[PDB]
């Protein structure tokens, strides 16, 4: 791709998310989602193979279905309220349709069925954009309509996302599908606390984006898409094994790491509202995510899988890849728990 | 509420269930998606004309334009799939199962 | 809810202006010049009361002042007015520009026999002031009491007592 | 009958969607969506949406569905029980809705729906020397400045995006 | 199917055995139809007859689980005369687990389903007693 | 209503002439014909260029759809903003044309 | 800059006419003495009824009759 | 995250199409202008939780302006009883509800 | 939760009343921990590019420490501000609603009867 065209298209992706974030009219919300999808399709088709065309087709169909259900929810809001302010919806049918549309745009279960395919079909950088930047706009719309979101619907979506994103990654060897099922489970964690305290939703979103961006940046810096090629990293760059070790232990929510920070706070906001069974079963189901993280740490850092002979040539070259913010994101995804009361800046 | 709104909503749900139950062609899925868009255009138009809400009369045109641009993008995706397998069959889009 | 209050059919009886629209359009500028005051009193009452039931009598004055307008045409200048509204009446869009010589004859006969000056371009679209004796409606929307707002923030902002108070953190 | 005409058009509209939601082939599906666009345009026109109806013709049908039929013509090489059964199913569901709301003057699928003609809910005044719908569309250039900016930017990005992903390199 | 669970819980324990058994049968039948619908969704059967056979198998399995659960629970609460007692739903959940093991034609699955479904039904009874909320309304 | 009468008359005259043109020589009993194309039996080759000119039509037609309320838009009292946004939409149609030009999108159907 | 103009006017005069007409359309409404009158005419056009004011007692610039001297006049449009 | 950029910068990107009671071209009122003005001026500033219970009456009048469900139900009742009394022979329409009276103006 | 409080003055990182609060000291242990995070970021940046970890790029390590201390100072100001707003609204609500917050009579243990449970 032409770099000027790449910059204009990425600024258009950002502009779509911004127009979702800053606008007060539902038509501009729908316009921002349309602009975001329309600009992110070439980022997914960056390399021009049949897998990226399949992934972009599946992404287009699911996001287009979600955009049409979003506009039907908007139009029903116009029926029952005569106005267009981006606030609570004035009909439970419009609330259900908009919650379904945003659960499709986030790829929460049982609308998760596009996330592990599309992430596998696209490169690692566009997978990073899909799993970090494409969450910000629908979570903003969910942030603004939470007076009207049905409790049972969003909690069913949350627990179904956590359980399906737990069991999905247990069978995987591809790193992009592992990050995608990790995405599904984390979106379940983010929407389980949305109606109780949306500040912890914003906390979980920020800590998730930091940890996901760390893992995709490590996968790009080592050019690794499978488990078995990530297992050659100790013979190529032994620092990256320590980095994926601490970041995968952090994404599992093991204390004293930063990814223990959201889910603990989530439990801390779900027991104040007298829900005990629900954060308990959520935290027990998070052990599945921890299990396939531990599988990756056994394959990469804590053991040494056998390498090949041609690795000796790759010893004679240093990584010239721009590892943008990788030490910063590594620190901010592991050593951040003593700064846990910083979350009040998100209030 | 009004009796024509029943039919426009039911048309949206018919085109929804057509878009949610594929047969073979990706073009039939795109046509169901644009039937959904057409029903949204009609329903928004009948409300905005019915309420005499003047400034929202530019709203359906916008709802047309963006979505037709969306349709153009979808057609291009179909063509790229049609430039890979010769047809637009959705069962050829199954490489991402593994 | 309550019963709506409709006026009687006797309160709606008035001597109608039973002329066609080309008769009204031909006489329109002199109608706006001569029948200014009760028309503007009625439309002031109509935009202020926001209820036609509070505007019947002034409306009757409109229907009283229009008829006295037409009789004063019918007594003096029936021939140029008839010859002018017939020509206005021919056109499907009822153009003033097709009928300038019948307009000139009607304006000549009216200015001679009645002294009425036809309003210039811009005059009948002016916003005028109206001196009425009916009171200003204090609640024209019939709005009930509005809810009291939430109490605002006041007081100088002191630091957080023992910091965040998050589980073991002292700041 | 002629007091119900918009409702009647809507019935044909729903039947038109069962024309292509059953998906016989993308070409008959395109034809059914064209007929549906014409009758939904007629629904729009019978409320006073003249400009919006001619946008359904000019831009949706004459602009976009032409490109759908054009792209379909460059696929699906030129020479069912499921289509027939789904078509008669949608037909019977719609005429059962018709029969219920016409014998009861009320129905409730998801919301309550009146059974009278939709003429009842109109307005009894004039707009003077303009169409309100026309002036509200004309205010796209006076009041809709941000909307014009984001729409034109999306269309320019759409041109760039189509030229990227169709290039194959 | 929110009213299904309500008309299950509305009858007191050990009082009306037939409608408790029917209500649990209907709840199991609804759950079996849900499992059948997603099962023929994500896994295509080879025929319409194979699809309705899978649907009838899963629906009858879950309905028999519910029927024998409600029957064993109500009969245990009758002969023990202890209505607010989670041991009754423990025995009922183990009976439903043996039912699931007989439908799957295996004893290890039967013992596993006995233990886990008996603990699950005991926890559901204790949540009915002390008012445990799983979909808890936001209060703070 | 007069429009519906006119459309029905035009459709009825068209269907009548089509039925006459399809069934007036069918009355003749000419012969049964057996009769056992530049391409022999080859499949229709897709050309990317026809699809590109069709999508370019669709995109410029959406820009035309934005441009269509201009004779009514000139009647506004915010004429500086109206003129700026009108020139901006025609300029964005021109920029779309220039980008289609300079990246060889208008080639071999120029 | 003068050889470029003759060169493109010999090779591509359609595009020279296009950019010339477009440049005139851009710059010329900001240079015309009549652009003020377009706005003045559009605000002089009475689509709505001129809803009268309640006379409080002190409005010397609001007329009591359309044929009164005070108020906005359109002799500038009759003359031009 | 509603980053309220429009109030921070003081720009009006989309508030103008947001309600029917806003400024309209040629001052065209919506058919429910007054009801929406009353519901907004009731519910303004007091928050949505208090607005759902302290301004329910103006919201019900405004929803019934928008959808006319009570009005259509009342006309259904009157027209249904009217045709029932026509069927029973106990009612006859007046001449001004049959089209025989040379309407008012 | 506090979405209506920070909505009359939107997108203010530090409002004016935050200036009524004492700022974090430059010897804040939280700020020194954020400086330590900057130092660890400098060490990881030397490690992933295979530089000598403690020796190479002291300007770069010092800009890491400087950037984290600089950003974290404002983050701590906003943290202290939001907990101050939290307590201020808490106390004004307790003062504005005495019918919901009664002063409870503290009984002494000579009157308070508790059941004894023997460990045997
Ligand atoms: C506020 C939020 C800030 C978020 C981060 C902003 C920067 C990242 C985004 C853009 C980007 O990628 O920039 C590259 C990015 C470094 O990322 P990188 O490529 O991984 O760097 C590796 C080496 O620097 C590669 O070495 P090199 O030889 O190629 O170049 C040396 C380079 C040379 O530096 C320069 O040239 C700087 C001068 C240019 C700047 C503009 C001058 C005009 O030195 C550095 O940049 C030293 C590292 C500085 C720290 C980077 C991270 C900043 C702090 C992030 C937020 C921390 C929050 C903690 C909160 C904890 C509690 C919750 O930033 C810079 O290069 C400049 C950083 C300036 C920080 C200023 C902070 C206050 C601003 C007000
Ligand atoms: C009252 C009505 C409402 C109740 C609550 C709602 C109902 C749903 C409950 C929760 C969800 C359960 C799973 C539903 C889908 C079934 C899985 C499936 O497709 O399996 C096929 C397939 C398994 O086949 P396979 O992999 O080819 O291999 C199987 C072998 O060939 C051979 O396999 P096989 O022949 O041995 O059996 C295979 C199949 C057959 O399964 C069965 O026959 C079991 C059916 C249920 C038996 C137990 C019922 C107990 C009911 C409660 C007790 C009754 C009395 C209660 C009284 C009140 C309390 C005291 O087994 C499974 O599907 C087991 C895995 C799933 C766990 C099912 C747990 C059900 C608990 C129900 C509690 C109520 O699995 C998949 O395709 C998995 C992927 C599915 C992903 C999407 C799932 C979405 C589910 C959404 C449900 C909720 C929607 C919410 C909508 C609103 C928010 C958006
Ligand atoms: C500090 C912590 C972060 C250090 C990162 C860089 C470490 C490094 O490169 O060390 C190498 C360097 C010596 O090696 P070198 O010759 O320079 O170059 C590397 C060799 O080539 C090494 O040879 P190689 O690379 O060819 O092959 C051997 C291989 C060996 O590796 C393997 O064989 C693979 C892995 C083996 C098994 C796994 C072991 C455990 C690793 C994970 C640790 C998990 C536990 C952490 C906590 C639990 C939660 C996860 O890899 C390495 O040894 C690579 C170097 C990294 C080793 C140390 C890793 C530290 C970062 C991770 C832990 C800290 C951050 C996360 C904390 C999480 C939450 C608390 O060591 C040091 O320089 C250590 C620091 C000594 C001075 C400390 C001064 C502190 C002063 C504080 C006050 C001043 C600042 C004031 C600020 C405030 C102002 C207001
Ligand atoms: C005249 C003008 C100038 C005047 C200057 C006056 C001062 C002159 C001296 C200048 C230096 C002052 C230093 C700051 C003040 C002292 C802070 C302090 O000690 O807090 C004790 C702090 C609380 O204990 P305390 O007895 O209740 O409070 C004593 C004071 O009142 C503490 O005062 P406080 O109550 O106001 O403290 C507030 C609050 C007090 O704390 C709390 O309210 C409780 C929450 C604390 C965090 C707990 C997180 C637990 C989960 C994560 C665990 C992470 C793994 C542990 C470490 C793994 C290895 C890295 O602090 C925090 O919440 C901040 C978090 C802790 C940061 C402490 C400062 C670290 C700076 C250097 C960092 C180097 C790496 C340290 C290790 C990394 C982990 C911190 O102790 C701990 O939390 C235990 C861990 C130790 C923390 C670091 C100790 C600082 C010195 C490190 C030197 C050795 C470095 C070795 C190489 C690098 C590591 C391998
Ligand atoms: C439950 C929600 C929908 C309720 C209405 C159902 C209408 C009848 C359709 C039932 C399913 C019939 C069927 O065969 O579905 C499969 C078919 C696509 O399958 P195909 O590839 O054609 O054939 C292989 C078979 N799997 O699927 C289709 O062709 C489905 C097309 C659906 C179009 C909807 C038409 C309107 C229906 C009534 C309103 C809803
Ligand atoms: C109880 C009645 C259940 C009826 C639906 C189950 C039967 C079934 O799955 O039929 C198979 C059908 C696909 O048709 P099939 O014949 O396999 O396609 C090849 C071409 N003949 O499969 C399908 O069409 C799948 C979708 C059918 C509808 C699923 C949801 C409703 C039925 C399950 C709950 C009851
Ligand atoms: C490991 C898994 C542990 C699961 C523990 C579940 C504990 C039970 C919690 C739900 C429950 O039974 O709550 C009792 C409640 C009836 O009491 P109440 O809240 O008054 O309901 C009237 C509604 N206004 O009933 C309800 O709230 C609704 C009925 C809930 C029944 C839950 C089990 C149904 C079958 C499986 C699904
Ligand atoms: C790195 C931090 C850089 C901060 C720069 C300033 C950003 C700013 O002004 O943001 C405004 C926002 C407060 O605005 P507010 O309307 O209260 O946001 C509500 C969100 N639901 O303030 C904030 O969001 C401050 C917190 C930003 C934290 C970002 C890193 C985590």
Swiss-Prot record, chain A:
It comes from the Eukaryota. It is an enzyme of class 7 (translocase). It is a multi-pass membrane protein. Keywords: Electron transport, Membrane, Mitochondrion, Mitochondrion inner membrane, NAD, Respiratory chain, Translocase, Transmembrane, Transmembrane helix, Transport, Ubiquinone. Its EC number is 7.1.1.2. It catalyses: a ubiquinone + NADH + 5 H(+)(in) = a ubiquinol + NAD(+) + 4 H(+)(out). InterPro entries: Complex_I_Subunit_2, NADH_DH_su2_C, NADH_UbQ_OxRdtase_chain2, ND/Mrp_TM. One of its GO terms (molecular function) is NADH dehydrogenase (ubiquinone) activity. Pfam families: NADH_dehy_S2_C, Proton_antipo_M. Signal peptide: none annotated. It is found in: Mitochondrion inner membrane. GO terms for biological process: mitochondrial electron transport, NADH to ubiquinone; mitochondrial respiratory chain complex I assembly; reactive oxygen species metabolic process. Its main location: mitochondrion. Core subunit of the mitochondrial membrane respiratory chain NADH dehydrogenase (Complex I) which catalyzes electron transfer from NADH through the respiratory chain, using ubiquinone as an electron acceptor. Essential for the catalytic activity and assembly of complex I. Core subunit of respiratory chain NADH dehydrogenase (Complex I) which is composed of 45 different subunits. Interacts with TMEM242. This is NADH-ubiquinone oxidoreductase chain 2. It comes from Ovis aries (Sheep). The gene is MT-ND2.
Curated annotation (Swiss-Prot), chain B:
It catalyses: a ubiquinone + NADH + 5 H(+)(in) = a ubiquinol + NAD(+) + 4 H(+)(out). GO terms for cellular component: mitochondrial inner membrane; respiratory chain complex I. Gene3D superfamilies: 1.10.287.3510. One of its GO terms (molecular function) is NADH dehydrogenase (ubiquinone) activity. Its EC number is 7.1.1.2. The chain crosses the membrane at residues 1-21, 29-49, 61-81. Its main location: mitochondrion. It is a multi-pass membrane protein. Pfam families: Oxidored_q2. The keyword Membrane applies. It is an enzyme of class 7 (translocase). Core subunit of respiratory chain NADH dehydrogenase (Complex I) which is composed of 45 different subunits. PANTHER family: NADH-UBIQUINONE OXIDOREDUCTASE CHAIN 4L, NADH-UBIQUINONE OXIDOREDUCTASE SUBUNIT ND4L. Core subunit of the mitochondrial membrane respiratory chain NADH dehydrogenase (Complex I) which catalyzes electron transfer from NADH through the respiratory chain, using ubiquinone as an electron acceptor. Part of the enzyme membrane arm which is embedded in the lipid bilayer and involved in proton translocation. Belongs to the complex I subunit 4L family. This is NADH-ubiquinone oxidoreductase chain 4L. It comes from Ovis aries.
From Swiss-Prot, chain D:
Its EC number is 7.1.1.2. InterPro entries: ComplexI_Subunit6, NADH_UbQ/plastoQ_OxRdtase_su6, Nuo/plastoQ_OxRdtase_6_NuoJ. Keywords: Electron transport, Membrane, Mitochondrion, Mitochondrion inner membrane, NAD, Respiratory chain, Translocase, Transmembrane, Transmembrane helix, Transport, Ubiquinone. The keyword Coiled coil does not apply. GO terms for molecular function: NADH dehydrogenase (ubiquinone) activity. It comes from the Eukaryota. GO terms for cellular component: mitochondrial inner membrane; respiratory chain complex I. It is found in: Mitochondrion inner membrane. Its main location: mitochondrion. The chain crosses the membrane at residues 1-21, 25-45, 47-67, 82-102, 143-163. One of its GO terms (biological process) is mitochondrial respiratory chain complex I assembly. It is a multi-pass membrane protein. It holds the Pfam family Oxidored_q3. Belongs to the complex I subunit 6 family. Core subunit of respiratory chain NADH dehydrogenase (Complex I) which is composed of 45 different subunits. Core subunit of the mitochondrial membrane respiratory chain NADH dehydrogenase (Complex I) which catalyzes electron transfer from NADH through the respiratory chain, using ubiquinone as an electron acceptor. Essential for the catalytic activity and assembly of complex I. This is NADH-ubiquinone oxidoreductase chain 6. It comes from Ovis aries (Sheep).
From Swiss-Prot, chain F:
It is found in: Mitochondrion inner membrane. The chain crosses the membrane at residues 3-23, 50-70, 79-99. Its EC number is 7.1.1.2. It catalyses: a ubiquinone + NADH + 5 H(+)(in) = a ubiquinol + NAD(+) + 4 H(+)(out). GO terms for molecular function: NADH dehydrogenase (ubiquinone) activity. Pfam families: Oxidored_q4. It comes from the Eukaryota. The keyword Transport applies. One of its GO terms (cellular component) is mitochondrial inner membrane. Keywords: Electron transport, Membrane, Mitochondrion, Mitochondrion inner membrane, NAD, Respiratory chain, Translocase, Transmembrane, Transmembrane helix, Transport, Ubiquinone. One of its GO terms (biological process) is mitochondrial electron transport, NADH to ubiquinone. The keyword Membrane applies. PANTHER family: NADH-UBIQUINONE OXIDOREDUCTASE CHAIN 3. Core subunit of respiratory chain NADH dehydrogenase (Complex I) which is composed of 45 different subunits. Interacts with TMEM186. Interacts with TMEM242. This is NADH-ubiquinone oxidoreductase chain 3. It comes from Ovis aries. The gene is MT-ND3.
């Amino acid at each position: 791709m032409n770099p000027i065209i790449l910059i204009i298209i990425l600024m258009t992706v950002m502009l779509g998310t911004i127009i979702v974030m800053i606008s007060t009219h539902w038509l501009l919300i729908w316009i921002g989602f349309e602009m975001n999808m329309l600009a992110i399709i070439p980022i997914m088709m960056k390399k021009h193979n049949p897998r990226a065309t399949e992934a972009s087709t599946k992404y287009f169909l699911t996001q287009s279905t979600a955009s049409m259900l979003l506009m039907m929810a908007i139009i029903i809001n116009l029926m029952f309220s005569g106005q267009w302010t981006v606030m609570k919806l004035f009909n439970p049918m419009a609330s259900m349709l908009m919650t379904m549309a945003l659960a499709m745009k986030l790829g929460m279960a049982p609308f998760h069925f596009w996330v592990p395919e599309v992430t596998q079909g696209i490169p690692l950088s566009s997978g990073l954009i899909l799993l970090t930047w494409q969450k910000l706009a629908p979570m903003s719309v969910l942030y603004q309509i939470l007076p009207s979101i049905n409790l049972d619907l969003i909690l069913t979506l949350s627990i179904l996302s956590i359980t399906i994103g737990g069991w999905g990654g247990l069978n995987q060897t591809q790193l992009r599908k592992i990050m995608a099922y990790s995405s599904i489970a984390h979106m379940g964690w983010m929407t389980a606390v949305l109606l109780y305290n949306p500040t912890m939703t914003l906390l979980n979103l920020i800590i998730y984006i930091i940890m996901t961006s760390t893992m995709f940046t490590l996968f790009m810096a080592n050019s690794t898409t499978t488990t078995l090629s990530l297992s050659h990293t100790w013979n190529k760059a032994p620092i990256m094994t320590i980095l994926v070790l601490i970041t995968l232990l952090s994404m599992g929510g093991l204390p004293p790491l930063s990814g223990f920070m959201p889910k603990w706070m989530i439990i801390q906001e779900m027991t104040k509202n007298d829900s005990i069974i629900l954060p308990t079963l959520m935290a027990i189901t998070a052990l599945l995510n921890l299990y396939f993280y531990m599988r990756l740490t056994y394959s990469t850092a804590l053991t040494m899988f056998p390498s090949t002979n041609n690795m000796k040539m790759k010893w004679q070259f240093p990584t010239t890849k721009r590892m943008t913010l990788l030490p910063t994101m590594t620190v901010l995804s592991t050593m951040l728990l003593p700064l846990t009361p910083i979350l009040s800046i998100l209030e | 509420m009004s009796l024509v709104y029943m039919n426009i909503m039911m048309a949206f749900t018919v085109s929804l269930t057509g878009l949610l139950m594929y047969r073979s062609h990706l073009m039939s899925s795109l046509l169901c998606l644009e039937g959904m868009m057409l029903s949204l255009f009609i329903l928004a138009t009948l409300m905005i004309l019915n309420s005499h809400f003047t400034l929202a009369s530019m709203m359906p045109i916008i709802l047309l334009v963006f979505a037709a641009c969306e349709a153009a993008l979808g057609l291009s995706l179909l063509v790229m799939v049609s430039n890979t397998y010769g047809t637009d069959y959705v069962q050829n889009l199954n490489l991402l199962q593994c | 809810p309550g019963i709506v209050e409709l006026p009687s059919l006797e309160d709606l009886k008035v001597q109608e202006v039973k002329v066609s629209s080309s008769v009204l359009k031909a006489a329109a500028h002199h109608y706006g010049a001569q029948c200014d005051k009760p028309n503007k009193e009625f439309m002031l009452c109509r935009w202020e009361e926001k209820d036609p039931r509070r505007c019947l009598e002034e409306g009757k004055l409109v229907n009283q002042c229009a008829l006295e307008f037409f009789r004063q045409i019918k007594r003096h200048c029936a021939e140029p007015f008839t010859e002018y509204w017939t020509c206005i009446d021919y056109s499907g869009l009822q153009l003033f520009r097709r009928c300038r010589k019948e307009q000139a004859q009607f304006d000549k006969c009216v200015l001679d026999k009645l002294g009425w000056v036809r309003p210039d371009l811009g005059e009948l679209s002016k916003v005028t002031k109206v001196k009425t004796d009916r009171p200003l409606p204090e609640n024209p929307y019939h709005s009930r009491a509005r809810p009291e707002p939430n109490p605002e923030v006041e007081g100088d902002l002191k630091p957080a007592r023992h910091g965040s108070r998050l589980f073991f953190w002292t700041m | 009958m002629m007091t119900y005409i918009v409702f009647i058009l809507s019935i044909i509209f729903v039947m038109g969607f069962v024309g292509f939601s059953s998906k016989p082939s993308p070409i008959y599906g395109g034809l059914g969506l064209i007929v549906s666009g014409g009758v939904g345009c007629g629904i729009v026109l019978n409320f006073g949406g003249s400009f919006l109806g001619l946008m359904v013709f000019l831009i949706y049908l004459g602009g976009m569905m032409v490109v759908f039929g054009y792209t379909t013509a460059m696929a699906t090489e030129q020479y069912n029980k499921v289509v027939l059964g789904t078509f008669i199913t949608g037909l019977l569901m719609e005429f059962l809705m018709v029969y219920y709301v016409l014998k009861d003057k009320e129905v409730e699928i998801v919301f309550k729906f009146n059974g009278m003609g939709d003429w009842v809910i109109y307005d009894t005044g004039d707009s003077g020397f303009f169409s309100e719908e026309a002036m509200g569309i004309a205010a796209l250039y006076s009041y809709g400045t941000w909307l014009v900016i984001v729409t034109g930017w999306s269309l320019l990005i759409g041109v760039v995006v189509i030229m990227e992903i169709t290039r194959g390199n | 199917a929110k009213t299904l669970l309500h008309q299950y819980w509305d009858i007191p324990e050990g009082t009306e055995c037939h409608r408790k058994t029917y209500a649990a049968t209907s709840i199991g039948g609804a759950s079996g139809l849900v499992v059948s619908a997603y099962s023929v969704a994500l896994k295509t059967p080879t025929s319409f007859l194979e699809g309705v056979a899978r649907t009838g198998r899963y629906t009858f399995t879950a309905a028999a689980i519910g029927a024998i659960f409600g029957l064993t629970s109500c009969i245990s609460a009758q002969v023990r005369e202890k209505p607010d007692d989670p041991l009754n739903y423990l025995i009922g959940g183990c009976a439903g687990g043996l039912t699931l093991g007989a439908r799957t034609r295996s004893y290890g699955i039967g013992a596993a389903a006995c233990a886990y479904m008996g603990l699950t039904a005991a926890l559901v009874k204790m949540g009915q007693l002390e008012g445990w909320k799983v979909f808890a309304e936001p209060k703070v | 209503m007069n429009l519906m009468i006119t459309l029905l008359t035009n459709f009825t005259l068209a269907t009548l002439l089509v039925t006459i043109a399809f069934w007036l020589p069918q009355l003749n009993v000419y012969s049964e014909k057996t009769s056992p194309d530049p391409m022999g039996s080859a499949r229709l080759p897709f050309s990317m260029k026809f699809f590109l000119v069709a999508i370019t039509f669709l995109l410029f037609d959406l820009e035309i759809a934005l441009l269509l309320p201009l004779p009514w838009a000139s009647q506004t009292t915010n004429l500086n903003t109206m003129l700026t946004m009108a020139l901006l939409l025609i300029f964005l149609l021109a920029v779309s044309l220039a980008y289609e030009w300079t990246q060889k999108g208008l080639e071999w159907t120029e | 800059v003068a050889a470029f103009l003759k060169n493109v006017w010999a090779k591509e005069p359609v595009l020279v006419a296009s950019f010339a007409i477009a440049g005139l359309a851009v710059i010329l409404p900001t240079l015309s003495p009549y652009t003020k009158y377009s706005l003045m005419i559009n605000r002089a056009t009475p689509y709505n009824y001129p809803v009268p004011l309640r006379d409080d007692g002190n409005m010397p610039d609001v007329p009591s009759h359309p044929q009164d001297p005070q108020g906005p006049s359109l002799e500038w449009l009759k003359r031009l | 995250p509603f980053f309220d950029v429009q109030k921070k910068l003081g720009v009006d990107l989309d508030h103008w199409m947001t309600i029917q009671s806003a400024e309209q071209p040629h001052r065209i009122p919506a058919r429910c202008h007054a009801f929406e003005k009353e519901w907004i001026e009731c519910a303004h500033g007091i928050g949505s939780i208090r607005a759902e219970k302290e301004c329910k009456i103006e919201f019900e009048d405004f929803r019934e302006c928008l959808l006319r469900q009570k009005t259509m139900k009342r006309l259904n009742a009157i027209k249904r009883q009217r045709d029932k009394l026509i069927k029973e022979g106990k009612y006859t329409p007046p001449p001004h509800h049959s089209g025989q009276e040379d309407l008012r103006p | 939760m506090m979405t209506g409080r920070q909505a009359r003055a939107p997108l203010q990182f530090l409002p004016d009343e935050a200036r009524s609060l004492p700022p974090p000291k430059l010897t804040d242990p939280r700020l020194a921990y954020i400086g330590f995070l900057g130092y660890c970021s400098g060490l990881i940046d030397n490690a992933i590019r295979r530089r000598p970890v403690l020796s190479a790029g002291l300007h770069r390590q010092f800009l890491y420490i400087t950037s984290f201390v600089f950003v974290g100072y404002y983050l701590l100001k906003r943290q202290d501000y939001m907990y101050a707003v939290r307590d201020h609204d808490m106390f004004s609500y307790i003062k504005s609603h005495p019918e919901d917050f009664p002063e409870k009579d503290k009984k002494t243990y000579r009157e308070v009867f508790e059941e004894f449970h023997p460990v045997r």
